[PDB]
Amino acid sequence: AEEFPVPNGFESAYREVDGVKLHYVKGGQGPLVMLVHGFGQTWYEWHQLMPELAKRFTVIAPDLPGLGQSEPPKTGYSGEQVAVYLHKLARQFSPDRPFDLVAHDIGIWNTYPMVVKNQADIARLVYMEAPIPDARIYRFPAFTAQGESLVWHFSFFAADDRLAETLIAGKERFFLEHFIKSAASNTEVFSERLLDLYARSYAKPHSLNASFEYYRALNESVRQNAELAKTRLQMPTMTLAGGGHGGMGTFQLEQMKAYAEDVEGHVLPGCGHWLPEECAAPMNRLVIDFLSRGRH
Amino acid sequence: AEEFPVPNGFESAYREVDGVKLHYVKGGQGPLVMLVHGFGQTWYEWHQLMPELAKRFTVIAPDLPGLGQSEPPKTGYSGEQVAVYLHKLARQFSPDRPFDLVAHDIGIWNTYPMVVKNQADIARLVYMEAPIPDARIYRFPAFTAQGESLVWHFSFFAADDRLAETLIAGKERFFLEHFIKSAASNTEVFSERLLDLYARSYAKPHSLNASFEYYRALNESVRQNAELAKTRLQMPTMTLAGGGHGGMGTFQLEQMKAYAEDVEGHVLPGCGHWLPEECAAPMNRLVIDFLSRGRHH
* Torsion sign (Cα): A151, A152, A154, A156: negative
Query: Do B203 and B180 touch, CB atoms closer than 8 A?
Result: no
B151–A144 CB contact, under 8 Å? no
Q: Which of B143, B150, B168 sits opposite A154 (nearest CB)?
A: B143
According to the 3-state scheme, what is the secondary structure of B38-105?
Answer: CCCCCHHHHCCCHHHHCCCCEEEEECCCCCCCCCCCCCCCCHHHHHHHHHHHHHHHCCCCCEEEEEEC
CA-nearest residue of chain A to B165? A167
CB contact under 8 A, A141 and B138: yes
Most B CBs within 10 A among A138, A146, A151, A152, hence the mutation to make, goes to A152
- Technique behind the model: X-ray
Query: Which value in Å is the resolution of this experimental model?
Result: 1.9
Residues 6+ away with beta carbon under 8 Å from B105? B37, B38, B39, B40, B41, B128, B129, B130, B273
- Residues of chain B with C-beta less than 8 angstroms from the C-beta of A145: 138, 219, 222
> Nearest Cβ partner of B152 from A156, A167, A168?
A156
**CA of B171 vs chain A CAs: smallest distance (Å):** 7
Tell if the CB–CB gap between B171 and A167 is shorter than 8 Å. Answer: yes
3-state SS track over chain B: CCCCCCCCCCEEEEEEECCEEEEEEEEECCCEEEEECCCCCCHHHHCCCHHHHCCCCEEEEECCCCCCCCCCCCCCCCHHHHHHHHHHHHHHHCCCCCEEEEEECHHHHCCHHHHHHCHHHEEEEEEECCCCCCHHHHHCECCCCCCCCCCCHHHHHHCCCCHHHHHHCCCHHHHHHHHHHHCCCCHHHCCHHHHHHHHHHHCCHHHHHHHHHHHHCHHHHHHHHHHHCCCCECCCEEEEEECCCCCCCCHHHHHHHHHECCEEEEEECCCCCCHHHHCHHHHHHHHHHHHCCCCCC
**Which has the closest alpha carbon to A20: A74, A93, A67?**
A74
Contact A166 B171 (CB under 8 A): yes
Q: Which residues of B touch A168 (CB under 8 A)?
A: 167
Give the three-class secondary structure for A77: coil
- φ, ψ (nearest 5 deg) of residue B261: -75, -30
In whole angstroms, give the CA distance from residue A54 to residue A26: 9
Residues of chain A that touch chain B, judged by Cβ-Cβ distance less than 8 Å = 135, 137-152, 154-156, 158-161, 163, 166-168, 171, 174-175, 178, 182, 218-219, 222
d(CA B207, CA B251): 29
Cβ–Cβ below 8 Å for A141 and B141: yes
Which residue of chain A is at minimal alpha-carbon distance from B164?
Answer: A167
User: What is the total residue count of chain B?
Assistant: 297
Domains and CATH numbers, chain A: 9-292 (3.40.50.1820)
Q: What's at B75, amino acid-wise?
A: T
Q: Quick check: B6 and B25 in contact, CB under 8 A? A: yes
Least CA distance to B148: which residue of chain A?
A: A155
DSSP assignment of A2-70 equals -SSPPPTTEEEEEEEETTEEEEEEEEESSSEEEEE--TT--GGGGTTHHHHHTTTSEEEEEPPTTSTTP
Please, what is the Cα angle at B95 between B94 and B98, to 5 degrees? 60
Of A140, A160, A182, the CB nearest to B143: A140
Closest partner CB to A148 (pick from B149, B155, B171): B155
Chain A residues touching B138 at Cβ < 8 A: 141, 143-145
Neighbours of A5 (CB within 10 A): 10
